[PDB]
Structure formats: structure tokens, C-alpha cells
Amino acid sequence: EHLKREHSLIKPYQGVGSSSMPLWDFQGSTILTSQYVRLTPDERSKEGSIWNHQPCFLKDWEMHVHFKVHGTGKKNLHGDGIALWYTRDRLVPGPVFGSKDNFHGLAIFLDTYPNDETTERVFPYISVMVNNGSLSYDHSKDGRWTELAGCTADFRNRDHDTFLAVRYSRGRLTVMTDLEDKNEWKNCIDITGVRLPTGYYFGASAGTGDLSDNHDIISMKLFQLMVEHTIDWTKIEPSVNFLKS
């Protein structure tokens, strides 16, 4: 296998009911059960996260997340969503799906609720953001101003398992979904020129406001990609290069 166990969360969770080294720190509203990590309960005004206990120095990787978002809210009344992170800092709660704003690195947002009254998107909506510390995620507008790419995605209250994959290698960032019980990865996002350093932390977070949902992480499995390279990679500033019009 090219599984990197130390950057993964897999049942039975390491160090849970044992003297073993835990591989994750659990923060905020997060609660830990034998069959899932629940970042937030279906309760209002919650912020919870899980952060890999050590930084990841892989240059080429692919993270598979088995998650579940589910709740009893009537009509459209649920929120806020989950964020997956590969960032400089860790463990700090905030308004960005339970984690700090003005972050450094990569976010993948699984946004369940249209905060934006004049949105032109259909929700839930998965998108990516790359940040150098300067940008704020505008939650009130579902991050309209800072979205690199995204896709609509039906992932709440499904009768079968839902998964997400995030692959990063040689500047190419690909997000794929498996939401329709097809045992297939469907493309959501595929962009190039994404610059990220090594030495950042994997984490996941969720938040709730006046609207809520259960936001569960079942597993996160990080794979090392065997990719050739021919620079101090820890000093790369998070950024994106853009093909000219």
C-alpha cells in the first residue's frame, strides 16, 4: 500500500481505548464515538474540528474522506457545512465552517446552505480556496469572491455512503466525489498552477449557526503518490498561477 497511516483516521481510531499514540487532536464541539467522529451535533452555534497531530511532508498525495452530513431540519433549514484543510496553522476555531479565517493553505468547502440571497449556484456546493493569510472567506456570500472552482453536489441525508477525494500533485488539484452509490469518482474540480508547500496540517472542521446538521467524519485515508521530481518545498507561498485569457 501507499497508505500513509500516520496521516489517516481509520476505525478503530488509534489511541481510542488504548495506550497507543493518537494521530489526531479533537477540538471544539467534536465528539468521538466508536463509529464516527462527529464534528458538530445537530445543534445550533457549534464549531468543532479534528487536526492531524503532525505536519505532512508528502509532495504528491490523495486524501479520501468518508463523511456523513445529515439532520432533521425542515425545508432548506440546515447548515453550515464541512471544511477540509491543508494549512499552516491548526486547532483554531472560527467562522469558516468552524475554523479560523485568514488561513494559509488550501480549503475544500462542503457548503450545504445558500447564505447568499442573490446566489447563482445550486446547493450543497463544493469549492476550493487557496489563501496566503490575506483573504477572508465571506460566509454571508458563500465565499463567492474567493472561490477558485466548485461544483454542485448532493451529499446530505443519502441512504448510502458518501465520499470525497482530494488529489494534489505537481500543481494539479483534483476534487472528486462518490455520492450516488456508483463506486466511482466523479470529477468536481480539476485545476492547475496551485502552489502549496510541504509541512502543512491536514484537518477537518464543521460549523453550525442558527441552522444545524450532524457533520460526521468516518475516515480519512491519505495515500502517497509515486510521482517523479527532477527548492525548499516547506517555504513555497500558497498561491495560484493562472493561464492567461
Site membership for Cl ion, residue 206 (CB under 5 A): no
CB 158 within 8 A of CB 170: no
Q: Which residue shows C-alpha cell 525548499? A: 232
Window 121 to 150, contacts with Cl ion (CB under 5 A) = 138, 143, 145-146
Question: Residue 236 has what DSSP assignment?
Answer: P
2 is in an annotated binding site: no
Q: Which does 142 bind (CB under 5 to 8 A by kind): Cl ion, Ca ion, none?
A: Ca ion
Q: What is the DSSP string of 18-74?
A: SSSPPSEEEEET-EE-SS-EEEE-S-SS-EEEEEESS-B--SSEEEEEEEEEE----
Q: Using CB under 5 A as the criterion, what x/- string covers residues 175-204 for binding Cl ion? A: --x-xx-----x------------------
Q: How far apart are CA 38 and CA 102, in angstroms?
A: 25
8 near Ca ion (CB under 5 A): no
User: Is residue 213 part of an annotated ligand binding site?
Assistant: no
CB 160 within 8 A of CB 181: yes
Interface map 139-158 toward Ca ion (x if CB under 5 A): ---x----------------
CB atoms within 10 A of CB 205: 32
Nearest approach in angstroms of CB 43 to Cl ion is: 4
Q: What is the DSSP letter of 153?
A: -
For the record, the C-alpha cell of 85 comes out as: 484543510
Min CB(62)–Ca ion separation in Å: 26
Cell for 12? 478503530
* In the complex, least distance from residue 188 CB atom to Ca ion, rounded to whole angstroms: 17
Here the contacts of 143-149 (C-beta below 8 Å, separation 24 or greater) are 143/109, 143/111, 144/116, 144/119, 148/189, 148/191, 148/240, 149/189, 149/190, 149/191
Give the footprint of Ca ion on residues 105-124 (CB under 5 A): 111, 113, 115
Look up residue 149 and give its three cell numbers: 472552482
**List 2, 3, 43, 133, residue binding Cl ion (CB under 5 A):** 43
Q: Is 25 annotated as a binding residue?
A: no
88 binds, among Ca ion, Cl ion, none (CB under 5 to 8 A by kind): none
Q: Does 213 bind Ca ion (CB under 5 A)?
A: no
Work out what residue 111 binds among Cl ion, Ca ion, none; the CB cut-off runs from 5 to 8 Å by kind.
Ca ion
Contact flag: residue 115 with Cl ion (CB under 5 A): no
Near Cl ion by CB under 5 A: residue from 7, 9, 86, 90:
9
State the residues that interact with Cl ion by CB under 5 A.
Answer: 9, 13-14, 23, 43-44, 138, 143, 145-146, 156, 158-159, 177, 179-180, 186
Name the residues that contact Ca ion, by CB under 5 A.
111, 113, 115, 142
